[PDB]
Each structure stands twice: as C-alpha cells, then as structure tokens.
Amino acid sequence: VLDGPYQPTTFNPPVDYWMLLAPTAAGVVVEGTNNTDAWLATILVEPNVTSETRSYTLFGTQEQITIANASQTQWKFIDVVKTTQNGSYSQYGPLQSTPKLYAVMKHNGKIYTYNGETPNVTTKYYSTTNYDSVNMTAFCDFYIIPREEESTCTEYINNGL
Ligand SMILES: CO[C@]1(C(=O)O)C[C@H](O)[C@@H](NC(C)=O)[C@H]([C@H](O)[C@H](O)CO)O1
C-alpha cells in the first residue's frame, strides 16, 4: 500500500494509482499537463487569507493569481486549470484541510483530485484528453497508492499520516 516517500521529480504515473502528496510549505504542490487541452496545477494556501494577488511559477512561467482562504484554521488546496496553451487559469474544487495532504489520480479519461473539507472529503475530476500520458511534476515528497486501496488514501487525506 504505502509506497514511498519519493522525492520531487517529473514522471509519468501509472493510471489507477493515487499520488499522495505531502507538502510542508505553501505554494505549488503538483502540476501536470497533456500539452494540448489540460494544464493543471495545485496550489496550497495558508489558513486565513483575505483576497490578494500572488505570483506563482507554473510550468516554468510566472503567473499572477488572485487567491483567498476564508478558513481561520484550515489550509486550502486549490486546483488551477487552463484548457489551451495561452488560456487563463480558473480555480476549481477546493479542499480545506487540516492534515496538509492531497492526492491526484489518472483514471478513465480524467484526472481525479480530492475535495471538500477534512475529515469528510469527497473526490472531483477533470476530463483530460490522452489522460494516460499526462506527466506530473511533484514539488514535494509523495507516496503511491493503488486505486484498489482508495479507502486507505481517503483515511490519510481525512486524518493524516
Ligand atoms: C466538462 O465537465 C467537467 C469535466 O471536465 O468532465 C465536469 C467536472 O465535474 C468538472 N470538475 C470540476 C471540479 O468542476 C470539470 C471542470 O469544470 C473543467 O474540466 C475545468 O476546465 O468539467
């Protein structure tokens, strides 16, 4: 089950495996693209942030994104997604988190990520052309968990390692 931790790297994860990410600092957690119609990055925002514009390096280039975190005590993982190379990023499906863990999976034509509020998370997805060949760059330590053991992954997301 808990295969890792692996150090930050760019690689092509197998389909139907959760990549469980364990960031320590606010910032970009993971990014992945098919180079055609999906660029996804996950940003971790600290507790308690009134609307402000921040700079992030996404896919090698500096981007300005206006972020907020309404929670006083919980972190906020936000997916930013653009659907063409020169498109703008929009924000989707936050996870409010105490344990500071996130996960992403390639499955059935889509990229799945966790969502909602710990300790009662759900999942959400994004349709992604050529989903199986999406390369991911992790910016923090990560673990690999098969989809068959999703219930273990969900437990870690909800309650921590
Ligand atoms: C086209 O419908 C879908 C999709 O991709 O299958 C449905 C899906 O529930 C939705 N996911 C979320 C978290 O909103 C997703 C995004 O809106 C879109 O991919 C972002 O560009 O759109």
From Swiss-Prot:
Q: What is the effect of changing residue 103 to G?
A: In strain: Isolate MMU-18006
Q: What residues correspond to the site Binding to sialic acid?
A: 38, 127
Q: Where in the cell is it found?
A: Virion
**Which branch of life, at top level?**
Viruses
Q: What is the disulfide pattern of this chain?
A: 140-153
Q: Where is this region: Spike head?
A: 2-161
| Function statement | Forms the head of the spikes and mediates the recognition of specific host cell surface glycans. It is the viral hemagglutinin and an important target of neutralizing antibodies. In sialic acid-dependent strains, VP8* binds to host cell sialic acid, most probably a ganglioside, providing the initial contact. In some other strains, VP8* mediates the attachment to histo-blood group antigens (HBGAs) for viral entry.
| Record's protein name | Outer capsid protein VP8*
